[PDB]
Amino acid sequence: STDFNDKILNEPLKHSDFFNVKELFSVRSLFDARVHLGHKAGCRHRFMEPYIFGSRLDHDIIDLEQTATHLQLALNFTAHMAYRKGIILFISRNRQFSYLIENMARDCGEYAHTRYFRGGMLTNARLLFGPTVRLPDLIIFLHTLNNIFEPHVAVRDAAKMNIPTVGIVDTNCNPCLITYPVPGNDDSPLAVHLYCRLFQTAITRAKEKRQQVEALYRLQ
Amino acid sequence: AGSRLETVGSIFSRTRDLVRAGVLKEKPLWFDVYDAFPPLREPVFQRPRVRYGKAKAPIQDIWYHEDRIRAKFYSVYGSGQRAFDLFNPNFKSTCQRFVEKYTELQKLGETDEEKLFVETGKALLAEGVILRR
Amino acid sequence: VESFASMLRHSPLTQMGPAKDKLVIGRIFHIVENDLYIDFGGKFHCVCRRPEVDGEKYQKGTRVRLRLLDLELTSRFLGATTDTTVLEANAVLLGIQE
């Protein structure tokens, strides 16, 4: 099994971009999707200040040059986790996009939770699913705030369960506990559709690459 | 299972320490991926603070030179009766045409704001765009 | 290669300047009884009541003329450290875009 580990699981970690996620998007694409449009300056969260290019007539603008690097890292992590056959759980309480996120999760063979988050999904999983339930290996927040403009409880619960998190963080969100934050707009439908497209494509290509590499290893 | 002290360190530091100490028999699936490709900032908890005294947010207002021209335009000729189309990535308003002509007249001529304004208005009217004061 | 600064500078939304009392074209993308949800290219949509004059023409995909008042409706209230937002823009529905 040592050769299997070395050739399958350890090889992809030796390359800067093994799944070529850099060609899925560009700064111009994010601009066209309005990923740079943040909330007004009055709703700004302090920890989002380093990611803000400036304030255009009291409306924050998210620096897309930083968004490019952050999204690159997040998509690379997601692709690597999908290649490793890890469970990926999308979370979002924005009801305008619940159907889209559920469809996307079903399409890429991953899991979604767009509904009310009952207390203890992650911290009390053994009682609520069974003594042998397997928790997600990665959680992706398309919206990190619940409907009262406070952090989704799943962020803190995922930190407690030592589950890495990718997150889309707007100017009024707190990125302190998201492992791989991506500063960007999370309200306009174009941006959310772009995020769903990018993550679905990354996960799907990673799975196809895993099957291809395993088949090649078996043949040789 | 790992520690649940989410406010102490990060998930990476906690997992690494517990793996080193023998509490965790095996590293989790994500540990190697994180270690090879870490985030720009380690996700450590921090309590946001209210600012006081002279402490101010370092966010700057976004202004360009032509904004001045735009301001004058929107005060003299008013909002253009033509409507904005923000869906077009290359939409050109009457104010934007005025700004471009103003910049060209500035670069090919002298620098007197009022004369530039009237010359730009004359040139635009010659082009055939209505500009009611 | 165009940088983000150039994109922001030459963006139509940047060029528009202040949003108050500006005429824009929006597209209806959702209808709930007599409430029309309209996107005009901003961060948020605006929701308008169906006019009583020629109300049947207002359907999904319809182009409409709007007079913007606010790109986002926010306000700080007593005893709060952050603004409260309704996640909606304020606009006046004028008519159909012929």
């Binding site: - | 700057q60 207002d61 976004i62 904004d67 735009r70 | 600064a5 500078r9 202040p18």
Partner: peptide
């Protein structure tokens, strides 16, 4: 780069509102 924003006072700043008797004795 020339496209960066430049330090400036708000040119769209609306004049402060005045009472009906402002400036009158």
């Amino acid at each position: 780069n020339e496209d960066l924003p430049i330090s400036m006072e708000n040119p769209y700043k609306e004049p402060l509102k005045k009472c009906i008797l402002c400036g009158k004795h």
